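Task: complex structure prediction.
Instruction: return structure tokens for all chains below.
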Amino acid sequence: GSVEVEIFDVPGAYEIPLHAKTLARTGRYAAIVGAAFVIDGGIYRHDFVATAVINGMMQVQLETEVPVLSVVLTPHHFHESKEHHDFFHAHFKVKGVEAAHAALQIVSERSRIAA
Amino acid sequence: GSVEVEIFDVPGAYEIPLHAKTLARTGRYAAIVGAAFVIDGGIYRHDFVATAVINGMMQVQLETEVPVLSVVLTPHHFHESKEHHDFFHAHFKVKGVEAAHAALQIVSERSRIAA
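Output:
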């Protein structure tokens, strides 16, 4: 109960950096977490959007001085064979806990070095 | 009605060269057509089996002197998004007619040069 998490929905991974910048400039937040699943669909190339999103999140966190943790993940292969579907459920379940621990420790450290 | 086609079922693309060799050595056939859809499932590599099948069909047709036409096709991308599923139905529909024309022409030419 010491930390409250607010959920913000967004149509796609491309819309995350600007939303993060707005929420960072509005204050009220010690850290920002952005999660998405960027997938190569086999028709169009997907690396441009992933690179843009990662670089934009880094630029936003450098601009506003608010930590932004990345949970946008691009798998090597995903062909929707229900085996990948079963695997990535549990893998993202693990990644959520990892991101929570990272966010807690980075916020604590940043508050420590500011004194 | 001048040409009769007999259908032979086979569990996978790997089992085609030996079946073709048996049907070629048994006689009764002027040409042999082998069809399969070799797909990269995203877990294991698929090029070894495709290379083996193509080379084996070529070796069989050189050994038995019976034409073997290849309708084993390996797409660049296939992620089972129902768009690929709709596309490849019609594309294989076209490939069947192409293979029929090729078989007729090659049998006629081979019978011609043997006189």
